[PDB]
Amino acid sequence: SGFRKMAFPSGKVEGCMVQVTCGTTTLNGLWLDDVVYCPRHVICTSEDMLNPNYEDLLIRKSNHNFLVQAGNVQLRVIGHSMQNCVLKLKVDTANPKTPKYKFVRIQPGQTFSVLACYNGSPSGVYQCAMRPNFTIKGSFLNGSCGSVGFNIDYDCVSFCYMHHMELPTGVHAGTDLEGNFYGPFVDRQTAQAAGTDTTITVNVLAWLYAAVINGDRWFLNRFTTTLNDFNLVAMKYNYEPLTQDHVDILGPLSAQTGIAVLDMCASLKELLQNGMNGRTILGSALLEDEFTPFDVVRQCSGVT
Amino acid sequence: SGFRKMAFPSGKVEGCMVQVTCGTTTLNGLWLDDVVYCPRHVICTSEDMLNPNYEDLLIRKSNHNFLVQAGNVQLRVIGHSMQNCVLKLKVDTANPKTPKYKFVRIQPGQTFSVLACYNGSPSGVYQCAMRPNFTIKGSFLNGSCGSVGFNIDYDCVSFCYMHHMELPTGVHAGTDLEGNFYGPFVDRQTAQAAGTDTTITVNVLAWLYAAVINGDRWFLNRFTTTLNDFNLVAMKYNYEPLTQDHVDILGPLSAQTGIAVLDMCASLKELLQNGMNGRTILGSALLEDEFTPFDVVRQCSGVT
Ligand SMILES: O=C1[C@H](c2cccc(Cl)c2)CCCN1c1cncc2ccccc12
Ligand SMILES: O=C1[C@H](c2cccc(Cl)c2)CCCN1c1cncc2ccccc12
C-alpha cells in the first residue's frame, strides 16, 4: 500500500554523466559508448544567447576546445558534430559503464525520471511528465543543462529528454537525444510562448484507480457518463479530450478494481464540478496527472 | 526554478542490494563490506508472524539456510547473528561496490530517500519523512522488506531506515540499521497503534520559503506573530510546536528571502485559519511538510 511519485533507480544514468566545458561555459554531458551528447549552447557565452548562429560559432571551435571530464579523469575528444540542438563529441574511450540503451522521443502526457546534474555530478532524481504543451515542470538551476530524462525497462535505459532551457515562466524546455526540441521552443534567449497547459485526463483517471486500489474510495459515486458527455466537462476544465485509446489503456486498472472506465469518468466529472470539499486523495488536495496507466500498474505490482 | 519532491541519486545504494531467502521467505538485504543486513522476520513463515519467538526460531537456522544472491551470483554465508530486529549475515566476500557509509538513527521530521526493492532488485526511488508518530508514508508491497532509507553527503551514504512492516492503516514502520524500530512498533502481526500524526511545522515553513524563492508569493501578508501566539494556532491544527531551535534553522532561508521567520509564521497562521481558497503553492493544494530547511537550501543551491 501507499502511492508515491516514484522515480526509476538512477544508477545506470549516473555512470553516464560527465562535465563538458567549452570556453567559459560548463554543463553536463551524456557519455554512451564513445560519444558524449550535450546541449549545443555549451559553445555560447551569455552574450551570444540573445541571437546565436550556432553553425558560425561552432566554426571557431576545434576538438581540443571541448573539455570532457568523467569524475576526475579527462576524456580525449577526437571528433565533434552538431545534430539539431545537441553536440556529439566523439571521445577515444567507450564508457565502461554504458548500459543497454535506446533514444526515444516521448509523447505528451508520458512520464519520465530526471537525474538533475551539476558539473557532471548527480544531485537528485525526480519523476515528471511531458506536458501537453511540451514543457516539463522540473527543478533545474543554471548549470543543470545536459541533465537527462529517462525510463528503464528491466535493464534497458530509454533516454527521452535532455534539459536545455528555462522559460521566463519558470517551466522547462528541452530536447530528445537527437537534439530536437519538444514543442516550438528554440535555443535562443528570447520571449517564447509555452502554450495552454491542459490536464492529462487519462493519467488523472489512472491515479483515481490507484487511489481505489490503495483504499481511498470516498470519491466513487452512483453515476456513469459517456465519452462525449465527459468530454464536454473535460473541455470546460481544460482537461485533455478522452478517446477510446485512453479507455483501452485503462482496461487493466478497470479490471483490477471492477469499476468501469465510464463510471470512473463520472467520479472525475463530479470532482471537477464540485471540488474536493476539503478532502484529499492519496495525500493530495488536487487531481494528480503525472502517473500514466502503466506507472500505476508498475507501482502497484512492483516491477523491477 | 521549480521545486520537486527530489530524492538522492540511488546508484550507491543499488550496488548494495541483495536477495535474502530463508526457507520459503524472500526479502531484500543490504550488503556492506562482508555483512548482509536484513529484517529478522526473514526466518518467519506467515503462520509464526502472529506470535514469533525470534530467538527460538533462529535456533533452528544454520548458515546454509540463509541464501544470499547478489545479481546472479550466490554469496557464501559464514556467520549469522541477531541484533535487535535485524539479522547480520557474515559472508566470505566484501561487497566491491560498498560506498563510504554510516548508520544513523534519524529524528522525527527528518527526510530521506527510499530505494524500494523486490528480490534484491531496485524498482524505484522516492523521498519521504519520518513522521512525528515514527511511521513513514511509503509505497511498499509484500517482498519490499529490507528496502532501505538513506541520505547522501557528497560520497558518504548515511543509512537510516530498513523497511519491515505495513500497519493495517496502510502506513509503514521499520528500523534503523542497528535493528531498533522507529516508534513503538514490534515485528509481530498484531494490531498496533501508530499515534496522532502531526504536521512538521518547521518543514512547512521551509517549503513556504522555497515557494517565495521560486516565485509563488500570494500567501505573504502584512502581519507578524510571536512563537507563543503561533503555537496556540499550531496546537489547534495538530502542527508541531515551533521552538527557537526551529527558528534558528530557518535563519538562512529567512536571510535569503528577507522575510523574518515570525512574519512567515503569520503567513502560515493565516493559511491555516483561512485555507488556500482554491489556490496552490508550488503546485500543491495543501501545506507540504516533507522538505526540511536543509532540503530547501540544497535543492535551491544544487549541492551534488
Ligand atoms: O535557460 C538557460 C539558458 C538558456 C537561455 C536561452 C536558451 C537556452 Cl537553450 C538556454 C542558458 C543558461 C542556463 N539556462 C538554465 C537552464 N535551466 C534552468 C535554469 C535556471 C536558472 C537560470 C538558468 C537556467
Ligand atoms: O508487513 C508485512 C509483514 C509483517 C507483519 C507483521 C510484522 C512485520 Cl515486521 C512484518 C511480513 C510480510 C511483508 N509485510 C509487508 C511489508 N511492507 C508492505 C506490505 C504490503 C502488503 C503486504 C505486506 C507488506
XYZ file of C-alpha atoms and ligand atoms in Angstrom:
656
model
C 0.000 0.000 0.000
C 0.952 3.643 -0.401
C 1.330 5.647 -3.567
C 4.328 7.790 -4.176
C 5.630 9.955 -7.032
C 8.306 7.365 -7.704
C 11.329 7.711 -9.973
C 13.364 4.914 -11.618
C 16.608 3.952 -9.803
C 19.270 6.306 -11.251
C 22.431 4.200 -11.085
C 22.548 3.324 -14.768
C 22.281 7.025 -15.719
C 24.771 8.279 -13.031
C 27.515 6.173 -14.694
C 26.966 8.141 -17.937
C 27.149 11.708 -16.550
C 30.201 13.778 -17.495
C 31.102 17.505 -17.353
C 31.558 19.351 -20.594
C 33.286 22.753 -20.724
C 33.792 24.940 -23.744
C 35.496 28.239 -23.183
C 33.892 29.661 -20.075
C 30.651 27.589 -20.255
C 30.224 24.357 -18.296
C 27.271 21.956 -18.453
C 26.523 18.223 -18.291
C 27.073 15.642 -20.990
C 25.848 12.068 -21.521
C 28.580 9.541 -22.282
C 27.253 6.449 -24.085
C 29.757 4.233 -25.930
C 32.463 6.598 -27.373
C 30.071 9.586 -27.747
C 29.279 12.463 -25.354
C 25.972 14.208 -26.027
C 25.349 17.730 -24.726
C 23.298 20.904 -25.461
C 24.826 22.828 -28.358
C 24.637 26.088 -26.342
C 27.786 24.882 -24.469
C 29.736 26.828 -27.213
C 27.780 30.007 -26.249
C 28.606 32.742 -23.728
C 25.632 34.600 -22.100
C 26.083 37.389 -24.692
C 25.535 35.308 -27.873
C 22.488 33.519 -26.316
C 20.407 36.569 -27.463
C 20.770 35.662 -31.162
C 23.254 32.833 -31.790
C 24.345 31.467 -35.159
C 25.356 28.023 -33.871
C 26.968 26.963 -37.158
C 29.149 30.137 -37.239
C 30.021 29.824 -33.526
C 30.933 26.126 -33.923
C 33.383 27.015 -36.789
C 35.603 28.772 -34.202
C 35.732 25.552 -32.074
C 38.126 22.617 -32.527
C 38.189 19.204 -30.729
C 40.617 20.499 -28.071
C 38.212 23.349 -27.069
C 35.726 20.801 -25.633
C 36.889 19.634 -22.239
C 35.113 16.475 -21.121
C 35.729 15.235 -17.570
C 34.346 11.939 -16.180
C 34.766 12.049 -12.393
C 38.393 13.177 -12.070
C 39.691 11.905 -15.457
C 39.879 13.798 -18.699
C 38.477 12.287 -21.916
C 40.267 12.855 -25.218
C 37.985 14.467 -27.847
C 38.623 13.031 -31.300
C 35.512 14.336 -33.086
C 32.721 16.889 -32.894
C 29.499 17.419 -34.796
C 26.150 19.157 -34.366
C 22.885 17.189 -34.682
C 19.968 19.651 -34.444
C 20.400 21.281 -30.927
C 22.921 18.789 -29.470
C 26.663 18.317 -29.925
C 28.101 14.835 -30.261
C 31.685 14.769 -29.030
C 33.467 11.643 -30.119
C 35.976 10.552 -27.480
C 38.745 7.907 -27.749
C 37.319 5.760 -24.899
C 33.981 3.924 -24.725
C 32.154 4.445 -21.388
C 32.796 1.198 -19.492
C 29.568 1.891 -17.574
C 27.365 2.246 -20.705
C 24.112 0.467 -20.040
C 21.803 -1.079 -22.684
C 20.104 1.989 -24.114
C 17.751 3.482 -26.691
C 16.906 7.045 -27.690
C 13.142 7.670 -27.727
C 11.008 10.745 -28.489
C 8.208 10.546 -25.911
C 4.589 11.589 -26.439
C 2.987 14.451 -24.455
C 1.407 13.005 -21.283
C 4.137 10.345 -20.921
C 6.193 10.381 -17.722
C 9.965 10.003 -17.088
C 12.614 10.308 -14.375
C 15.132 13.187 -14.391
C 18.577 12.931 -12.885
C 19.438 16.610 -12.182
C 23.188 17.178 -12.521
C 25.706 19.959 -11.881
C 29.341 19.828 -13.138
C 28.852 16.224 -14.336
C 27.768 15.155 -10.828
C 24.274 13.951 -9.917
C 22.351 15.872 -7.257
C 18.871 14.381 -7.329
C 16.252 12.311 -9.084
C 12.559 13.098 -9.551
C 9.633 11.967 -11.685
C 7.807 14.270 -14.048
C 5.707 14.328 -17.251
C 5.987 15.843 -20.678
C 3.141 18.359 -20.512
C 0.658 18.559 -23.425
C 2.273 21.994 -24.137
C 5.725 20.262 -24.447
C 7.245 21.799 -21.301
C 8.283 19.970 -18.121
C 7.752 21.326 -14.608
C 11.269 20.465 -13.457
C 13.643 21.637 -10.744
C 16.670 22.992 -12.528
C 19.205 25.711 -11.703
C 21.895 27.235 -14.018
C 24.454 24.510 -14.743
C 21.812 21.748 -14.919
C 21.708 21.782 -18.762
C 22.581 18.429 -20.268
C 20.737 16.657 -17.378
C 18.645 13.836 -18.922
C 15.176 12.326 -18.615
C 14.750 8.573 -18.982
C 12.724 5.431 -18.428
C 14.006 1.924 -17.587
C 12.598 -1.374 -18.868
C 14.348 -4.089 -16.788
C 17.986 -3.317 -17.874
C 17.429 -1.012 -20.875
C 17.550 2.751 -20.385
C 15.374 4.708 -22.833
C 16.736 8.257 -22.869
C 13.943 10.664 -23.821
C 14.889 14.179 -22.663
C 17.920 16.468 -22.443
C 17.491 19.654 -20.433
C 18.318 22.882 -22.279
C 16.243 25.845 -21.144
C 14.184 27.569 -18.515
C 11.396 29.780 -19.821
C 10.663 33.177 -18.134
C 7.561 31.455 -16.685
C 9.748 29.075 -14.618
C 8.935 25.942 -16.642
C 11.459 23.920 -18.631
C 12.083 23.066 -22.277
C 14.488 20.601 -23.804
C 15.160 18.044 -26.487
C 15.081 14.324 -27.285
C 18.597 12.720 -27.613
C 18.693 13.545 -31.347
C 18.590 17.300 -30.420
C 15.023 18.090 -31.484
C 13.112 20.289 -29.059
C 9.898 19.066 -27.627
C 7.417 21.744 -28.715
C 8.043 25.028 -30.508
C 10.988 26.186 -28.402
C 14.262 27.400 -29.873
C 17.625 27.571 -28.078
C 17.602 31.387 -28.094
C 17.194 33.782 -25.156
C 14.013 35.319 -26.420
C 10.405 35.520 -25.201
C 8.827 32.160 -26.085
C 5.160 31.145 -25.652
C 4.736 27.827 -23.787
C 1.023 27.414 -24.604
C -2.091 26.404 -22.639
C -1.231 23.609 -20.223
C -4.110 21.166 -20.120
C -4.514 18.328 -17.603
C -3.656 14.770 -18.749
C -7.107 13.189 -18.291
C -6.021 9.545 -18.805
C -3.350 10.000 -16.080
C -5.827 11.529 -13.578
C -8.138 8.509 -14.173
C -5.174 6.124 -13.672
C -4.363 7.955 -10.371
C -8.039 7.630 -9.304
C -7.730 3.880 -9.996
C -4.522 3.852 -7.855
C -6.446 5.606 -5.051
C -9.222 2.919 -5.104
C -6.531 0.174 -5.080
C -4.784 1.850 -2.116
C -8.078 2.291 -0.178
C -9.192 5.916 -0.836
C -12.749 5.436 -2.142
C -14.821 8.440 -0.886
C -14.985 9.910 -4.429
C -16.627 6.860 -6.043
C -20.259 7.709 -6.833
C -23.546 6.115 -8.080
C -23.220 7.688 -11.569
C -21.979 6.928 -15.041
C -21.347 9.058 -18.172
C -20.495 8.711 -21.903
C -17.200 9.727 -23.643
C -18.952 12.695 -25.323
C -20.696 13.864 -22.104
C -17.465 13.508 -20.104
C -15.518 15.440 -22.818
C -17.985 18.385 -22.634
C -16.951 18.668 -18.937
C -13.237 17.980 -19.671
C -13.313 20.872 -22.223
C -14.774 23.270 -19.609
C -11.937 22.350 -17.183
C -9.025 22.360 -19.715
C -8.635 18.598 -19.432
C -7.418 16.589 -22.476
C -10.234 15.001 -24.502
C -10.566 11.316 -23.573
C -10.633 8.853 -26.504
C -11.333 5.097 -26.859
C -7.494 4.584 -26.954
C -7.316 6.093 -23.438
C -10.281 3.883 -22.329
C -8.494 0.770 -23.727
C -5.277 1.578 -21.850
C -7.290 1.965 -18.619
C -8.619 -1.625 -19.212
C -6.272 -3.417 -16.800
C -6.986 -0.935 -13.961
C -10.715 -1.108 -14.688
C -10.479 -4.966 -14.408
C -8.302 -4.839 -11.259
C -10.866 -2.655 -9.448
C -14.143 -3.746 -11.059
C -15.009 -0.096 -11.830
C -15.930 0.546 -15.477
C -13.864 3.326 -17.121
C -17.009 5.427 -17.784
C -18.080 5.047 -14.133
C -14.636 6.353 -13.086
C -15.143 9.199 -15.625
C -18.378 10.119 -13.782
C -16.463 10.235 -10.462
C -13.920 12.563 -12.151
C -16.751 14.706 -13.615
C -18.240 15.147 -10.123
C -14.819 16.001 -8.615
C -14.337 18.635 -11.354
C -17.811 20.108 -10.842
C -17.830 20.022 -7.019
C -14.173 20.232 -5.973
C -12.600 18.125 -3.190
C -14.655 19.864 -0.387
C -11.529 19.995 1.803
C -10.778 16.264 1.413
C -7.698 14.539 -0.054
C -6.949 11.601 -2.407
C -3.636 9.766 -1.958
C -2.402 12.671 0.230
C -3.161 15.248 -2.472
C -5.736 18.057 -2.399
C -5.762 18.314 -6.213
C -6.195 15.885 -9.104
C -2.760 14.405 -9.956
C -1.911 13.837 -13.644
C 1.765 12.731 -13.558
C 1.135 8.978 -13.310
C 0.382 7.132 -16.559
C -1.815 3.951 -16.508
C 1.486 1.996 -16.983
C 3.062 3.768 -13.954
C 0.104 2.834 -11.717
C 0.200 -0.868 -12.676
C 4.031 -0.931 -12.274
C 3.978 0.734 -8.836
C 1.013 -1.338 -7.698
C 2.712 -4.634 -8.889
C 6.405 -3.873 -8.055
C 8.161 -4.346 -11.423
C 11.989 -4.215 -11.032
C 13.430 27.453 -10.702
C 10.938 24.711 -9.923
C 10.533 22.723 -6.751
C 10.238 19.000 -6.804
C 9.986 16.220 -4.205
C 13.523 15.177 -5.055
C 15.317 12.015 -3.965
C 19.093 11.415 -3.743
C 20.646 9.573 -6.733
C 20.325 5.850 -5.858
C 23.372 4.326 -7.544
C 25.439 3.925 -4.396
C 22.570 2.057 -2.677
C 21.648 -0.113 -5.749
C 25.156 -1.663 -5.617
C 24.414 -2.876 -2.058
C 21.032 -4.572 -2.661
C 20.938 -8.371 -2.441
C 18.164 -11.003 -2.124
C 17.951 -12.992 1.057
C 15.895 -16.202 1.268
C 15.342 -18.361 4.299
C 13.121 -21.358 3.865
C 10.165 -20.114 1.874
C 10.574 -16.386 2.747
C 12.403 -13.973 0.444
C 13.200 -10.313 1.130
C 15.938 -7.743 0.480
C 19.269 -7.431 2.229
C 21.913 -4.687 2.413
C 25.453 -5.826 1.638
C 28.095 -3.504 3.119
C 31.657 -4.834 3.478
C 31.343 -8.598 4.336
C 27.960 -8.209 6.124
C 24.387 -8.534 4.800
C 21.755 -6.807 6.927
C 18.097 -7.826 6.675
C 14.830 -7.891 8.711
C 14.890 -10.743 11.219
C 11.385 -11.843 10.108
C 13.081 -13.470 7.049
C 13.248 -16.654 9.274
C 9.425 -16.454 9.725
C 6.616 -18.029 7.690
C 3.228 -16.168 7.620
C 1.999 -18.503 10.403
C 4.612 -17.629 13.078
C 4.260 -13.852 12.353
C 1.229 -13.913 14.752
C 3.433 -14.507 17.822
C 7.072 -15.259 16.950
C 9.854 -16.157 19.371
C 12.708 -14.973 17.137
C 15.429 -16.445 19.363
C 13.740 -19.907 19.324
C 13.077 -19.716 15.559
C 16.689 -18.663 14.849
C 17.994 -21.748 16.795
C 16.572 -23.971 14.013
C 18.569 -21.995 11.364
C 22.198 -22.580 10.342
C 24.444 -20.518 7.979
C 23.471 -22.663 4.965
C 19.717 -21.913 5.471
C 20.280 -18.240 4.506
C 20.564 -17.919 0.757
C 22.051 -14.591 -0.290
C 22.107 -13.745 -4.006
C 23.781 -10.618 -5.467
C 22.545 -10.251 -9.054
C 23.040 -13.789 -10.386
C 25.838 -14.912 -8.002
C 25.472 -16.700 -4.716
C 27.257 -15.414 -1.593
C 28.701 -17.873 0.917
C 27.301 -17.332 4.447
C 29.977 -17.834 7.088
C 28.185 -16.272 10.076
C 24.798 -15.212 11.397
C 23.645 -13.185 14.370
C 20.616 -11.194 15.502
C 20.975 -7.527 16.529
C 17.593 -6.306 17.833
C 15.189 -6.783 14.799
C 17.834 -7.311 12.077
C 19.984 -10.285 11.089
C 23.619 -9.769 10.183
C 24.774 -12.473 7.792
C 28.523 -12.581 7.527
C 29.582 -13.576 4.014
C 33.064 -14.585 2.752
C 33.250 -11.714 0.206
C 33.297 -7.953 0.837
C 30.916 -6.014 -1.469
C 33.236 -4.500 -4.090
C 30.610 -1.770 -4.575
C 30.468 -0.754 -0.870
C 30.332 3.007 -0.705
C 31.559 5.185 2.204
C 28.775 4.739 4.732
C 27.426 5.410 8.215
C 24.442 4.086 10.152
C 22.328 6.898 11.628
C 19.118 6.946 13.699
C 17.188 9.911 12.278
C 14.958 12.288 14.240
C 11.194 12.563 13.569
C 10.618 15.270 10.925
C 13.876 14.429 9.097
C 13.605 13.349 5.461
C 15.309 10.526 3.486
C 15.237 8.714 0.141
C 13.915 5.135 -0.135
C 15.073 2.701 -2.768
C 12.126 0.241 -2.960
C 13.371 -3.247 -3.844
C 11.902 -6.641 -4.741
C 14.002 -9.864 -4.888
C 17.218 -7.853 -4.358
C 16.421 -5.686 -7.406
C 15.616 -1.968 -7.264
C 12.264 -0.805 -8.633
C 12.048 2.848 -7.656
C 13.270 5.734 -5.558
C 11.201 8.316 -3.680
C 11.642 10.900 -0.937
C 9.767 10.761 2.332
C 9.941 11.829 6.006
C 9.994 10.119 9.352
C 6.622 11.238 10.708
C 6.414 12.612 14.280
C 4.486 9.359 15.069
C 7.512 7.303 13.793
C 5.780 5.892 10.699
C 6.637 6.612 7.054
C 4.053 7.078 4.304
C 5.870 4.821 1.847
C 4.958 2.793 -1.224
C 5.742 -0.790 -0.374
C 4.268 -4.129 -1.458
C 4.953 -7.627 0.031
C 8.571 -8.514 -0.757
C 9.809 -4.931 -0.237
C 11.079 -5.646 3.321
C 14.775 -4.964 3.707
C 14.456 -1.927 1.347
C 16.457 0.947 2.914
C 16.128 4.677 3.536
C 19.206 6.880 3.254
C 20.768 10.293 2.814
C 23.946 11.192 0.880
C 26.544 13.794 1.870
C 28.829 14.150 -1.198
C 30.117 10.499 -1.318
C 29.005 9.169 2.091
C 25.746 7.241 2.370
C 24.040 7.553 5.768
C 21.674 4.591 6.050
C 18.807 5.494 8.389
C 15.874 3.140 7.716
C 15.181 -0.516 6.924
C 11.638 -1.380 5.887
C 9.944 -4.100 7.946
C 6.190 -3.655 8.238
C 2.954 -2.284 6.905
C 0.377 -1.358 9.525
C -3.359 -2.142 8.932
C -3.752 1.624 8.340
C -1.556 1.441 5.198
C 1.417 3.310 6.694
C 4.877 1.835 7.218
C 7.129 1.007 10.160
C 10.744 -0.049 10.212
C 14.102 0.153 11.908
C 17.450 1.962 11.907
C 20.403 -0.216 10.650
C 21.060 -1.482 14.199
C 17.560 -3.130 14.154
C 15.750 -0.777 16.535
C 12.253 0.186 15.434
C 11.402 3.785 14.998
C 8.490 4.262 17.407
C 6.643 1.691 19.498
C 6.199 -0.929 16.780
C 7.097 -4.583 17.229
C 7.763 -7.109 14.448
C 4.575 -9.048 15.250
C 1.377 -9.334 13.196
C -0.821 -7.726 15.776
C -2.955 -4.571 15.963
C -0.517 -1.714 16.637
C -1.386 1.954 17.315
C 0.549 4.388 15.080
C -0.405 7.530 17.040
C -1.578 11.046 16.124
C 0.276 12.255 13.043
C 1.049 15.928 13.456
C 2.365 18.234 10.716
C 6.100 19.107 10.737
C 5.786 22.889 11.201
C 9.468 23.745 10.548
C 9.277 21.841 7.216
C 6.070 23.634 6.105
C 7.811 26.988 6.840
C 10.890 25.839 4.860
C 8.556 24.899 1.931
C 6.886 28.349 2.173
C 10.387 29.871 1.932
C 11.031 27.647 -1.152
C 7.768 28.926 -2.686
C 8.843 32.608 -2.216
C 12.273 31.774 -3.740
C 10.584 30.064 -6.717
C 8.134 32.981 -7.249
C 4.865 31.919 -5.517
C 4.203 34.866 -3.179
C 0.374 35.312 -2.990
C 0.316 33.972 0.608
C 2.723 36.574 2.034
C 0.741 39.008 4.199
C 1.104 42.311 6.162
C 1.150 40.521 9.560
C 3.527 39.166 12.146
C 3.113 36.908 15.224
C 5.070 35.613 18.267
C 6.236 31.989 18.914
C 3.599 31.586 21.669
C 0.755 33.100 19.574
C 1.733 30.995 16.543
C 1.900 27.827 18.739
C -1.673 28.414 20.035
C -2.760 28.161 16.351
C -0.345 25.266 15.583
C -1.898 23.326 18.534
C -5.435 23.850 17.145
C -4.305 22.450 13.747
C -2.185 19.500 15.046
C 1.020 21.159 13.883
C 4.279 20.551 15.832
C 5.109 23.300 18.343
C 7.717 25.655 16.858
C 10.767 26.374 19.058
C 13.726 28.809 18.859
C 15.825 25.851 17.501
C 13.413 25.647 14.532
C 13.605 29.480 14.102
C 17.453 29.298 14.120
C 17.496 26.583 11.445
C 15.185 28.725 9.272
C 17.819 31.551 9.545
C 19.473 31.004 6.155
C 16.106 30.908 4.314
C 14.913 33.958 6.246
C 18.134 35.796 5.120
C 17.857 34.558 1.506
C 14.308 35.948 1.192
C 14.383 38.911 3.587
C 11.238 37.607 5.340
C 11.583 37.300 9.128
C 10.721 33.817 10.477
C 7.857 35.229 12.611
C 6.442 37.062 9.569
C 6.456 33.735 7.675
C 4.753 32.181 10.756
C 1.961 34.785 10.389
C 1.522 33.805 6.707
C 1.255 30.147 7.839
C -1.229 31.111 10.604
C -3.453 32.840 8.021
C -3.232 29.857 5.621
C -4.266 27.546 8.496
C -7.157 29.795 9.542
C -8.428 30.635 6.036
C -7.408 27.690 3.844
C -5.952 28.027 0.320
C -9.258 29.423 -1.171
C -8.799 27.195 -4.239
C -5.230 28.400 -4.906
C -1.964 26.415 -4.993
C 1.628 26.815 -3.703
C 4.416 25.083 -5.646
C 1.754 23.013 -7.485
C 0.226 21.774 -4.222
C -3.242 22.497 -2.816
C -2.135 21.608 0.733
C 0.716 22.624 3.032
C 3.715 20.342 2.309
C 5.839 19.172 5.268
C 8.300 16.689 3.680
C 11.076 19.188 2.907
C 13.429 20.099 5.764
C 15.127 23.571 5.835
C 18.333 21.722 4.717
C 16.469 20.118 1.758
C 15.204 23.521 0.555
C 18.668 25.142 0.642
C 20.215 22.060 -1.076
C 17.603 21.954 -3.862
C 17.668 25.721 -4.290
C 21.558 25.750 -4.467
C 22.208 22.449 -6.364
C 24.529 20.539 -3.995
C 25.917 17.359 -5.663
O 17.908 28.662 -19.589
C 19.121 28.685 -19.529
C 19.939 29.452 -20.559
C 19.277 29.421 -21.929
C 18.683 30.563 -22.451
C 18.074 30.539 -23.695
C 18.066 29.375 -24.447
C 18.666 28.247 -23.927
Cl 18.723 26.796 -24.884
C 19.258 28.249 -22.678
C 21.425 29.084 -20.576
C 21.982 29.078 -19.156
C 21.259 28.048 -18.307
N 19.794 28.051 -18.520
C 19.036 27.464 -17.460
C 18.508 26.188 -17.622
N 17.733 25.556 -16.731
C 17.469 26.189 -15.593
C 17.942 27.488 -15.277
C 17.649 28.146 -14.057
C 18.108 29.409 -13.820
C 18.857 30.080 -14.777
C 19.163 29.483 -15.967
C 18.737 28.158 -16.250
O 4.007 -6.170 6.809
C 4.485 -7.182 6.335
C 4.554 -8.467 7.148
C 4.776 -8.179 8.626
C 3.752 -8.375 9.544
C 3.947 -8.109 10.890
C 5.177 -7.659 11.343
C 6.192 -7.476 10.427
Cl 7.762 -6.975 10.986
C 6.007 -7.715 9.078
C 5.501 -9.521 6.569
C 5.248 -9.693 5.075
C 5.502 -8.389 4.341
N 4.949 -7.212 5.048
C 4.744 -6.062 4.223
C 5.640 -5.001 4.295
N 5.525 -3.849 3.623
C 4.487 -3.720 2.803
C 3.495 -4.716 2.614
C 2.395 -4.559 1.735
C 1.454 -5.541 1.617
C 1.548 -6.705 2.368
C 2.592 -6.897 3.227
C 3.615 -5.922 3.363
